Amino acid sequence: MNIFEMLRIDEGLRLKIYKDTEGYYTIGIGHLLTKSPSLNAAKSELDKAIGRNTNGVITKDEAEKLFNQDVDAAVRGILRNAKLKPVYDSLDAVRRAALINMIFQMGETGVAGFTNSLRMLQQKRWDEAAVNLAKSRWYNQTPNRAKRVITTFRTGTWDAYKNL
Numbered sequence: 001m002n003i004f005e006m007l008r009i010d011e012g013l014r015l016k017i018y019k020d021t022e023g024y025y026t027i028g029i030g031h032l033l034t035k036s037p038s039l040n041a042a043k044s045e046l047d048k049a050i051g052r053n054t055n056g057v058i059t060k061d062e063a064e065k066l067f068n069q070d071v072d073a074a075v076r077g078i079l080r081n082a083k084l085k086p087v088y089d090s091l092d093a094v095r096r097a098a099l100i101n102m103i104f105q106m107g108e109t110g111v112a113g114f115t116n117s118l119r120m121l122q123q124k125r126w127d128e129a130a131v132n133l134a135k136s137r138w139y140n141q142t143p144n145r146a147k148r149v150i151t152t153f154r155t156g157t158w159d160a161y162k163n164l
């Protein structure tokens with residue numbers, strides 16, 4: 001268990017281009033390709049990102065490389081966000097992955113809005129943070145995933161991912 005496996009499970013890994021919920025071309029582990037409605041355009045973007053003429057199809061390895069790039073971007077983002085940096089800075093390794101998981105799902109700005117829960121996490125008030133997060137829209141919208149992430153924050157272990 002590592003971040004890649006965690007996200008592969010939570011977000012799912014797609015080897016072919018598809019449309020996200022906002023109707024935007026995406027691939028791999030939730031990797032947004034473009035907001036253009038043009039598939040050719042998405043295809044061009046994809047080849048660039050993968051560094052291969054893929055004709056809209058990628059390998060798991062290529063998805064992982066892609067994923068790493070996103071993680072890196074997420075980390076740089078966190079590091080320039082006054083609401084997230086302090087929490088991230090305080091978190092142990094597994095909890096960091098749980099936070100990055102959230103960013104993958106909702107975007108940095110969206111995660112940064114969980115003001116109170118973030119504070120609790122920074123304070124190491126695990127159960128309190130868990131209870132607070134269980135009240136969220138996010139929890140009620142994608143409960144299975146949210147519950148896994150929450151359990152990860154509560155325990156600091158990968159326990160929620162052991163038997164899926």
